[PDB]
Symmetry: C3
Subunit: 291 residues, 3 copies
């Protein structure tokens, strides 16, 4: 009842908190079966089409890996004024049981899914919506700290542009949280983001460096800036973060986290990526109606 | 037994298929399709590997073979060094090779010495054996028979190499043929004369409207605006090779529209909702025809 | 344990890290596995396991060999396509994969990536250029073909100054009883680095100027490329090329090998000659790689 069977998965909006939880439990069960190395044939005979038109390789790899580890196969669309995307999507759905689609044009992911006879999982659309990233982001917080509820979640870097940070903020208003924003004056959190957050009644506070936002941070959620030192997490700056907290990062990083924070047990940006495989495994299994 | 299958054989042309062999392959695709529908654990090509070598792009063909392979339970292995050596090196790893190469002769010589069977996925003389087989399968499926059908090929028929081969295959059937091109790009007289030698009837028209009333199979292809035999012609002309729901109101109830795909504008999206719009089922049929090919060539049917 | 000579969960960075009984064991597994493939014995050895294929120099013969090996054992493969560091990608792949096969041309990059990688990394060619499984399969091939490696004469042809596989193989041979011969152009000799060390290890070395010259006493003709721009060409190009005419001066118990790809240096007419084992050497590579993948992942 709580698995989104045969449906398109375009935004994290569509999950009732109970479908969200079911998804998290199912990813927990898949993980444990993997750890004890069971013969997994859940999606044996099933085919996933991977259609990436903006290149995220964490996304494409985790999804492909996820499908392999269920016993499924992947067809990857490696394919200049060709056919309409919806036709390319329709045709691949003649071969596959589900389509994973990342497209940067606004509207497109949804327009491709529209008359598609198979379920399209959105892996990143034109408005930077990206549900499995949001789902793995929450799932991680709960995994690392026990609970999402009652935490301070601090976001660092280019918050003006990176539209998945703005995905997570809104979704985090379904929980009891306080949101901190670190960002240089030019790249601050946009207003209608902050308006929705306030509109749903979530406490928010802007800070100018990591150092000053840190001692009360439970989740330090880091992001690249691109084109200074007030947004670069270092082991120096870490001597101030609580003992229990976790540092997350959707990846890739370049500058924003020093390699020497990696052996910090609170550094969770690799565990985070692995959680991604497992929630994606759950979404696949669930979308194809086995779990 | 396996008296109907091409076990071990290079698959280079549809001309190397008899009535019986094609009939076997259609029944197997059928059989394999049903097994897939009933969710049957297919490990038919478990322990098998397919090398996929596509030197020209054709997302329709290549994705199709990988899908077919993956559903039989097998694997798919997806510059400077000669084609002979490349193919022969892949054949050290894999059981079958699926080869698409645009250089006239290239597929042929690559197979010549190959230790493993080779399936032509599209060559430079426009032989594409699985395209022709999926086309004829899709006709029989959709209409209940190929025999007695009036088949009407539409677009750039002079340079439609696989469509010659297809009009040339439809020899082995009792059919009637029609052609709908711009006078520039009419069906060639090379092939027209080969189909006339057979006793298969041919007629030409300038539009879809003209040819459409007693058409059983509308096989749409596109022009490419550059390939019009003049811009004068284009502007007096193009409206006659574009299918819309209004054109279709004159089509027979019992009728099917096909396309090899992809399309540009020649088939309006509004057509897609028509029950007679087969071109997507056409693409699914190719996967099941390719499943049937890999499995028989590799000795499992 | 029967995997007492298996390098389970260990980064495979160089062949000079394999003991003889370790390499012998791996050869034993390579064959056992080939025979299963021949029998169509159900190989669920790595079923459910994922290999990450990360190739930054498009060595498409070598990546396809690995991809073949993983699939024949029932595993699965993730292709890689290329801000982020090398070591980050490889760490990130290792979150998804059970083993990373990595080939990268920058000096020290492979070791750098494996250093803090939490999954075993198999070097598929590094920037010096250790190619562990190429060396292993060359040795395995000599032994399949001739029945021994000891006491053999091995003639390496071609661009010896620049040929990577020659350098590590020629070093790898000094652990056996062999006689090494070198047929390079005057300029493109076996480098003084390599020549100097094989002397220090016992093995005999001897430079020649032509294959016809070297061939009568050659058990393994290990051919390699020369190409236009390395000469620094007209006068000496014909002498380093294999034709069936050149092959009349060869033993009957003799093998011609080539890591490949090959262009001019082995005439197409030679391929029907039963002493030509370079395609069998390619197939041999797949079985060495299954053994390696299966040994690293705790199944042999």
């Amino acid at each position: 009842l709580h698995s989104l069977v045969g449906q398109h998965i375009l935004s994290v909006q569509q999950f009732t908190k109970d479908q969200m939880s079911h998804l998290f439990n199912v990813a927990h069960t898949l993980r444990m079966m993997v750890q004890k190395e069971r013969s997994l044939d859940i999606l044996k005979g099933k085919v996933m089409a991977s259609m990436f038109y903006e290149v995220s390789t964490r996304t494409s790899s985790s999804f492909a890996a996820a499908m392999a580890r269920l016993g499924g196969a992947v067809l990857s669309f490696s394919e200049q004024k060709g056919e309409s995307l919806a036709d390319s999507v329709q045709t691949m759905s003649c071969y596959a049981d589900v389509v994973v689609l990342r497209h940067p044009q606004p509207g497109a992911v949804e327009l491709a899914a529209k008359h598609c006879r198979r379920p399209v999982i959105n892996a990143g659309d034109g408005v930077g919506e990206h549900p499995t990233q949001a789902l793995l982001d929450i799932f991680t917080i709960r995994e690392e700290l026990g609970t999402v509820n009652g935490m301070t979640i601090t976001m660092v870097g280019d918050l003006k542009h990176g539209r998945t940070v703005h995905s997570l903020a809104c979704l985090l208003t379904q929980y009891r949280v306080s949101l901190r924003y670190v960002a240089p004056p030019s790249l601050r959190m946009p207003p209608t983001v902050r308006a929705f957050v306030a509109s749903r009644g979530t406490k928010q506070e802007e800070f100018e460096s990591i150092e000053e936002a840190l001692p009360d941070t439970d989740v330090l959620y880091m992001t690249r800036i691109q084109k200074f030192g007030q947004f670069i997490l270092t082991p120096h700056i870490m001597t101030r973060a609580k003992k229990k907290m976790v540092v997350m990062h959707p990846m890739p990083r370049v500058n924003e986290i020093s390699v020497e924070v990696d052996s910090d047990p609170r550094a969770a940006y690799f565990r985070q990526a692995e959680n991604g495989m497992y929630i994606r495994m759950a979404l696949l299994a669930t979308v194809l109606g086995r779990f």
